[PDB]
Structures are given as C-alpha cells and as structure tokens.
C-alpha cells in the first residue's frame, strides 16, 4: 500500500548527512546534567582573550622566557627604533601561535578588528617617551622618527601611563600587503641614582567583538 518511488541518492552513505538513527540502548535513563562553571557556546570567546606575543623571536632565544621581552636600553638614543612588525595574524610567525592565531588557523577565511596592548615593566622611578606609529596596508614602513610622526601615531609617556592600547580596523588574509606597527625612542630613559639601567616592554594581542570566520578546514600544526 502507499505507492512509493525511490529517487537518486537512495542507499548512499553521505559523510555529512543528518538523519534520525535507531538507539542501541533505549531502556537507559541518562545521568542528568550538572551546572559546571565555565561553559562555552562559541570559539570566539577564546579569541577575545589576551595572550602574550613573542615579539623577540630572533636566533638564540626561541626556547627561553626572553622571547617575550622587548629590550629598552639605557643611555641616550633618542631617535632609534625599538621594534616593528607587520600585523598578520594567522600567517606571521610572531602572531601565529597565540590564542587568536591558533583559532584563525582552523578557518580558510576570516576578518575583523584587532586589539594590541603594550605594558612597560620598569621601575617606578624611570621616565621617558615613546612614539607608536601605524601604517595602513599598502604603505611602506617608516624609516625615521620624523616620518613616523607625520603619519598616525601616539606619544606614550611611561612616567604617566604604564600601558597603551591600539585598535586596528581592516584585517583580512590571503611582500605582504599588510599594515605595520613601529616604535621609536622620542627621548630616552632617565633614572635616579640606584635604579636598574635597562628594562622591558610586553605586548598583548586580542580580537574585538566583530570577528568572523568561514570554511572550517584542517590545521597545519599536528
């Protein structure tokens, strides 16, 4: 009874199908759920957390805590570069193994805004100024302190603030075609008698709320 007609696709196993299946243990009442703290609904809750960037990824110190410390030297060098990098999460070595980088490497297309925080870890007696500069994608990195001043920049006085924040708006993926960030000595570091001479800066990266990902794929790390 009930005349019926089989269509193409019958009796195939499609690895991504979605069908009701027969239970092998129907007479078994399951343990009820517990209210465990710390539940997750979405992977973007992991990428919105700050993590420390290994900005000092040069030879001889890829296996020490020193990889995370930007060196600030003593004396008068008030126009020299402190650091610089291209902003390319997912592809570039300095951003590749962070919490944000590890997520982005599961997807073939992504886009959003990024947040960078810088923190000064010197003694409370040290004072000085840094110049933090941002170049957009398609622009060359500045070569001097003066042309970095002629673009988008902030002047950061560490005797007043211990930390600075930046939000970068046009991030996508695929000799890069990406924006960059650089830091310059505006003045030099000045200390009283009896304080350590050298010091360090640390970088933290995170994602802002408008971040999106597409086309789940396999990661290239295991």
């Amino acid at each position: 009874g009930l005349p019926v007609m089989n269509t193409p696709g019958s009796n195939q196993f499609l690895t991504s199908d979605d069908f009701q299946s027969p239970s092998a243990m129907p007479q078994f009442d399951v343990t009820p759920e517990l209210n465990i703290p710390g539940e997750v609904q979405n992977l973007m809750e992991i990428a919105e957390v700050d993590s420390v960037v290994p900005v000092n990824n040069v030879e001889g110190k890829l296996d020490t805590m020193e990889i995370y410390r930007i060196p600030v030297q003593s004396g008068n060098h008030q126009s020299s570069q402190v650091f610089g990098f291209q902003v390319q999460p997912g592809l570039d070595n300095v951003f590749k193994h962070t919490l944000l980088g590890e997520i982005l490497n599961y997807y073939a297309h992504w886009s959003g805004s990024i947040k960078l925080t810088f923190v000064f870890c010197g003694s409370a007696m040290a004072t000085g100024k840094f110049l933090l500069a941002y170049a957009p994608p398609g622009a060359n990195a500045p070569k001097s302190r003066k042309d970095a001043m002629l673009g988008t920049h902030i002047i950061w006085d560490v005797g007043l603030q211990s930390s600075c924040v930046l939000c970068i708006p046009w991030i996508s993926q695929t000799y890069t075609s990406a924006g960059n960030v650089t830091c310059w000595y505006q003045t030099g570091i000045v200390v009283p008698a009896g304080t350590p001479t050298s010091c360090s800066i640390m970088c933290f990266v995170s994602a802002c709320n408008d971040f999106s990902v597409r086309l789940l794929k396999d990661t290239p790390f295991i």
Partner: protein, 222 residues
C-alpha cells in the same frame, strides 16, 4: 555561526580500520575489535583538548568490504555474506573466541547485516555514571596517573555469521564516528607539542615559535 560548538565538533571521521577472516590458524584473526575513545585520532584529539569537560552522544556507521583469498579454489557460487556487529556497554562480557557464549548475551546490543544493502548504523547515548566526560585527569585510578574509570565508553566487535565449515573470505571494516548534541566546559590552551603516545600527555620540549631576521624586520611592500 560556523564557530559554534556544534559546527566545530559534530563532524564524521574514520577512526578505526580492521581486517578479519572466516577461516584461519590464529583464531584471533577471525574477528575484529575496537575500544571506543578519542585519543588515537590525532586531529580529533586536538580539537577535543581545547576543553576540560565534554558531553555528547555517539553515532557510528560501518563500511564493510569482502574478498576471496588468493589461495587456490575457483568456480564458486556464493550467496551474499552476513556480518554481526556487537556493542558491549561498560561492565559487559568480552568474547575471546568467535564461538564464545558472549556473542549471544541478551544485554549486548547487536546488528545483523548482509552485503549489498545500505551501510549499517547505530546510535549510542551519553553513558556515564558521572555528569560529564573529562579530557584531563590530575589523579590516580585508585594505580595509574591520569586515568579515571568514568571515561569508559564500551567496545565494538565484528564477526562473520556463517554456519559450519565456511569457505575462506577476508573482510575489512571501517568505522565512522560522530559526536552529537555536544556541550563543553573550561577552555584550555592549544597543544603546542607533538603527541607521543595515546594515554599520557608526555612530550619533548618545543620552541615557542620560529625565528625572523631581527626585531625590526618587516618585509618589503609590493
């Protein structure tokens, strides 16, 4: 939307492939067996380790192919072959021969299937007297470090369903596994080192990331 937990974890994968004969002189080659856990599939293992506690149902599909052994005898005319796929819950009897009594126990759910039809499929619920599974355990079994007995999920066994004095044949089974209705708790950092064995977290020390030329180096812009 593609970063939700369900779209990230609920995907099918081949986790075990095994071979078994109808006649042999080893008697362990007469059936195939697998213990259910998610630690010998390296790509699923890593995605599962981003969380500390998990809860899911299982769906298992079986792809089964046969062959006449190249031994000698031709001109045969055989009906299609029948197979038995048995699931053993935690706390069940385990067979040791293909003629054992446990292949007939009323509380081990079982599937009977003959070749030529659609591939067989069973659905297993969340089976634990605890409230969630754990990917990480900082304890002792009662003594093995890192192993707790609440993570038992059962076993699968496959044999041929012939009568007496069968003809020689060799079969291969592939098991496709998929978690469903998933919930996760307490996110973790991603595994940075390669896995060494299937029961521990043992590892050899690894570099934090790869090097570049200097702390100022940015590649020339196109």
């Amino acid at each position: 939307s593609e970063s939700s937990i369900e779209n990230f974890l609920c995907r099918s994968a081949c986790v075990y492939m095994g071979e078994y004969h109808t006649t042999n002189t080893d008697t362990s080659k007469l059936f195939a067996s697998w213990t259910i856990n998610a630690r010998r599939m390296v790509q699923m293992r890593r995605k599962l380790e981003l969380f500390t506690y998990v809860r899911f149902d299982m769906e298992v599909t079986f792809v089964i192919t046969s062959k006449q052994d190249q031994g000698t005898q031709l001109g045969q005319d055989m009906p299609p072959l029948t197979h038995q796929i048995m699931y053993i819950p935690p706390g069940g009897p385990i067979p040791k021969s293909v003629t054992d009594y446990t292949w007939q126990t009323s509380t081990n759910p079982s599937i009977f299937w003959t070749e030529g039809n659609a591939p067989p499929r069973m659905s297993i619920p969340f089976i634990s007297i605890g409230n969630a599974y754990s990917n990480f355990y900082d304890g002792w079994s009662h003594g093995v470090y890192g192993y707790n007995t609440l993570n038992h999920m059962g076993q699968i066994y496959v044999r041929h369903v012939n009568g007496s004095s069968p003809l020689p044949m060799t079969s291969t089974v592939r098991m496709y596994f998929k978690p469903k209705h998933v919930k996760v708790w307490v996110p973790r950092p991603p595994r940075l080192c390669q896995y060494k064995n299937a029961s521990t977290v043992n590892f050899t020390p690894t570099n934090i990331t790869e090097k570049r030329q200097s702390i100022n180096y940015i590649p020339e812009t196109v």
